[PDB]
Amino acid sequence: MNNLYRDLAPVTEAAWAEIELEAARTFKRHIAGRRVVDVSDPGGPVTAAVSTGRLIDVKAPTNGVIAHLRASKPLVRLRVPFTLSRNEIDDVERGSKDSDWEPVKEAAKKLAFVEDRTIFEGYSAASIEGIRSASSNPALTLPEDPREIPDVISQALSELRLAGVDGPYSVLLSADVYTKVSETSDHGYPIREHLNRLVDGDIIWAPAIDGAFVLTTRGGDFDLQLGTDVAIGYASHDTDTVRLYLQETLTFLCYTAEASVALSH
Amino acid sequence: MNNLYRDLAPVTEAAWAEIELEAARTFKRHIAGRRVVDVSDPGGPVTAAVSTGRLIDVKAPTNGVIAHLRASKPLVRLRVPFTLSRNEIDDVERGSKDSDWEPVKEAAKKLAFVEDRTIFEGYSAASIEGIRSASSNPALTLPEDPREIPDVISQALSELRLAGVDGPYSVLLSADVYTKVSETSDHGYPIREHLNRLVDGDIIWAPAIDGAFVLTTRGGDFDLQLGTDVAIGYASHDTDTVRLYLQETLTFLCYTAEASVALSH
Amino acid sequence: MNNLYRDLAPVTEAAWAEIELEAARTFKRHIAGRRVVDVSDPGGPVTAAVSTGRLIDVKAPTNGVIAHLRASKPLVRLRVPFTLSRNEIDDVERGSKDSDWEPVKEAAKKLAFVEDRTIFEGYSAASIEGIRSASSNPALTLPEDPREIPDVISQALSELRLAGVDGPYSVLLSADVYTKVSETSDHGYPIREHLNRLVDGDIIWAPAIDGAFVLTTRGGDFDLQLGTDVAIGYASHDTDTVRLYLQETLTFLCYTAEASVALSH
């Protein structure tokens, strides 16, 4: 067995298939970051750091010796525990199709939110700079009126053009901004369609982020490094409940500072 | 070896591939001129002039002798030096993917700007007349209001129609004008889309030019002659930096005076 | 080419072969550490850190999220520059066999001394704990009289026996201690032979270390990780001299605290 200790969990095979399906579905729906960044293959469990290729000056060991430390970025392992009713698990073999997988959905939504907020806003404790912090283009303010959203977005499209950047540009919106441009309409279309006319990429719902992000998806600018992708593991169990977790280990690198514009309220 | 002296540069193979990729990418993005003019095959290093096929009267050598000089256009070699950190070059073999290629990008942007400004505004010292100067159609004034841009552009489309010209017409805009028609919107579309409806060619971002240019891309009207295309060459190096250059040799010919309209502010 | 920039050096092929032979020979003679520790295959230039498999508690990103940083050990790149006369280099093609390779020998001796002192005494700036510091067995004092050396060494052999350890034990001596037990004799043998009778391993000359070390060579206790093994690289040159360097990148790990005894004066 492995670190998931999956065979020790009192979960049947059919219940496991339903839990895997629910977690994978809810996660994909709430991920916006993997649609725009380069996603590496999983390195594996032993992978601990990503080389940046830079060098750090250290106090010379002896006379005439020049020493340099190799710089690297550590992976962070992110774990979201959740708790399942054993009655709901037992219902699945009897043929129930409405078993309560709400904790699985909440854990997948929380893991997806962490991953997206780590990619776009950073996680300083894990030495990850967000796309918002690593952007060299000027930051823009989103207006109160949703009918004035496409104007400011177009100004962001000016800045990537002034930065000398090609590629399909894509706009990612926070859930508040996505709702505002979805529910306001002008001439038989919502403002989301007006945003769709400005770019050759995609208007992407990004419920974890704040503000908005416009960026190129030409490739090679944004890199998500995975040691291991999302997995479900077993912690402990009692007569009534099974404690499990969702787990993934990653770091994020931004190679190109001028490939994005961040917007705030 | 050749005049690039490329093997003498202290640049690794992987670093060379990254520099070539960065320079080629940034150059294409900033070229507008090659999308509309006929571009010849590279003549080669020995190519020095392009025959125009005209004749120049010279003082008769002797009695009964009629002499004429063949007219030609000289090529100009354009060189943009740039300077790279050797630490950034050394980072590439160690696996860095964020090496500072800003000087390469600035050199490619500057070379592209020179080439486009030479094609459209001319370079008198190199005996190159620009498209703006060689146009026989009347010049138009671009209005201050971007909502009045498509009107004047349509008047330019009248002039090529009054000049008796067929073919897909294409509109090239300066970066100021492109930004103005991109960021102003009317009825759910930016003014750039309104320009796109007027022509069967393309709205082309041309950040080097001034004003705007409307012209036919039927072929055979505008000819860019290349002796050698863009190449990267090695000048000199020290402990910290490598001096290199971008280099291209060309001339530009406009055969058809009535195939274009220039616009100014 | 690579980071060594070897083809840029004004060094002939025969001179290169002599320099490689001299450096490799002098290095092996002065290495004691690789004879007793496990030496990994070279990871390669991109390798920057070694995973330890441990976890570091970090401030929770959000509520209900448990985060942990993966622990790792950075590699250190160690570079010893040296300077060669170009006349000595030119002598080699003419058939000289006494070309002055003293700087190569001094650079190889200095690199070997650094590597051995890093393995056995540590390099705190590179986060490397030495075998002396990581040993859990008690430290012993070497006596002034060399005839009393084998007694104390035998007490060290008691401690590894009290630590519950098997395997061929090996004794490494500093150059002072090796000279003292080599030059003092008892009953027709030097004291080095008396040390040789106590162990089934080897009396190893270790000129870089202080004191003495007794340890098991059963395997899996001491691990030297190499990104890249010893290589010769080219820095710069003038009319008279060529500046080159010896370079290696490594870290050292001690997995088993009770597998060694350190001795001091």
CSV table of C-alpha atoms in Angstrom, one decimal, chain A residues 51-55 70 150-151 154-156 158 160-167 169 186-187 189 193-194 197-198 218-221 223 254-256 258, chain B residues 22 25-26 29-30 87-88 90-100 102 105 109 175 178-180 182-185 187-190 192-193 205 207:
chain,number,residue,atom,x,y,z
A,51,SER,CA,15.4,24.2,-9.6
A,52,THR,CA,15.2,27.8,-10.7
A,53,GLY,CA,18.8,27.7,-12.2
A,54,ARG,CA,19.9,30.7,-10.1
A,55,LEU,CA,22.9,30.9,-7.7
A,70,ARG,CA,21.7,26.5,-5.9
A,150,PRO,CA,-15.6,46.1,-21.1
A,151,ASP,CA,-13.9,49.5,-21.4
A,154,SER,CA,-9.9,46.8,-23.2
A,155,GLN,CA,-7.4,49.1,-21.5
A,156,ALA,CA,-5.8,46.0,-20.0
A,158,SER,CA,-3.8,47.8,-24.5
A,160,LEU,CA,-0.3,43.6,-23.1
A,161,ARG,CA,-0.1,45.1,-26.5
A,162,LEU,CA,2.3,47.8,-25.1
A,163,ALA,CA,4.2,45.0,-23.4
A,164,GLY,CA,4.9,43.4,-26.8
A,165,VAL,CA,3.0,40.1,-26.3
A,166,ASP,CA,1.2,37.8,-28.7
A,167,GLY,CA,-1.1,34.8,-28.2
A,169,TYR,CA,-5.6,36.5,-24.5
A,186,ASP,CA,-27.3,45.4,-23.2
A,187,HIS,CA,-29.1,45.1,-26.6
A,189,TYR,CA,-26.7,40.2,-24.9
A,193,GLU,CA,-20.8,38.4,-24.5
A,194,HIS,CA,-19.3,41.9,-24.9
A,197,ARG,CA,-16.1,39.8,-28.5
A,198,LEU,CA,-12.9,41.6,-27.2
A,218,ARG,CA,0.6,31.4,-25.7
A,219,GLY,CA,2.5,29.0,-23.5
A,220,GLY,CA,5.7,29.1,-21.5
A,221,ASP,CA,4.9,32.0,-19.3
A,223,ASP,CA,4.1,27.0,-14.9
A,254,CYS,CA,5.8,32.8,-13.2
A,255,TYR,CA,8.5,33.2,-15.7
A,256,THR,CA,7.2,36.2,-17.7
A,258,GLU,CA,4.7,41.3,-18.4
B,22,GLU,CA,12.7,35.0,-28.0
B,25,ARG,CA,8.8,35.7,-31.4
B,26,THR,CA,9.2,39.4,-30.5
B,29,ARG,CA,4.7,40.3,-33.2
B,30,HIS,CA,6.0,43.7,-34.0
B,87,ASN,CA,24.8,34.7,-15.4
B,88,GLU,CA,21.4,34.6,-17.2
B,90,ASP,CA,24.6,30.1,-17.5
B,91,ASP,CA,21.2,29.8,-15.8
B,92,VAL,CA,19.7,28.1,-18.9
B,93,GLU,CA,21.8,24.8,-18.7
B,94,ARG,CA,20.9,24.5,-15.0
B,95,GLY,CA,17.3,24.5,-16.0
B,96,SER,CA,16.1,28.1,-15.4
B,97,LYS,CA,13.1,29.2,-17.5
B,98,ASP,CA,13.0,32.8,-16.5
B,99,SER,CA,16.4,34.0,-17.8
B,100,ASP,CA,16.4,37.8,-18.5
B,102,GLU,CA,14.7,41.7,-22.1
B,105,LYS,CA,13.3,41.6,-26.8
B,109,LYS,CA,11.4,45.5,-31.1
B,175,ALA,CA,-0.5,52.1,-31.6
B,178,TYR,CA,-5.3,51.1,-32.4
B,179,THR,CA,-5.6,51.7,-28.7
B,180,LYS,CA,-8.2,54.4,-29.3
B,182,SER,CA,-9.9,49.3,-29.3
B,183,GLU,CA,-10.9,50.9,-26.0
B,184,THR,CA,-13.9,52.9,-27.3
B,185,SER,CA,-17.0,50.8,-27.8
B,187,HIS,CA,-23.3,48.9,-29.3
B,188,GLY,CA,-21.4,46.0,-27.7
B,189,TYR,CA,-18.4,46.2,-30.1
B,190,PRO,CA,-15.2,48.2,-30.1
B,192,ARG,CA,-11.9,48.1,-34.3
B,193,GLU,CA,-14.8,45.7,-35.1
B,205,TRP,CA,-1.6,46.6,-35.3
B,207,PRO,CA,3.1,50.2,-33.5
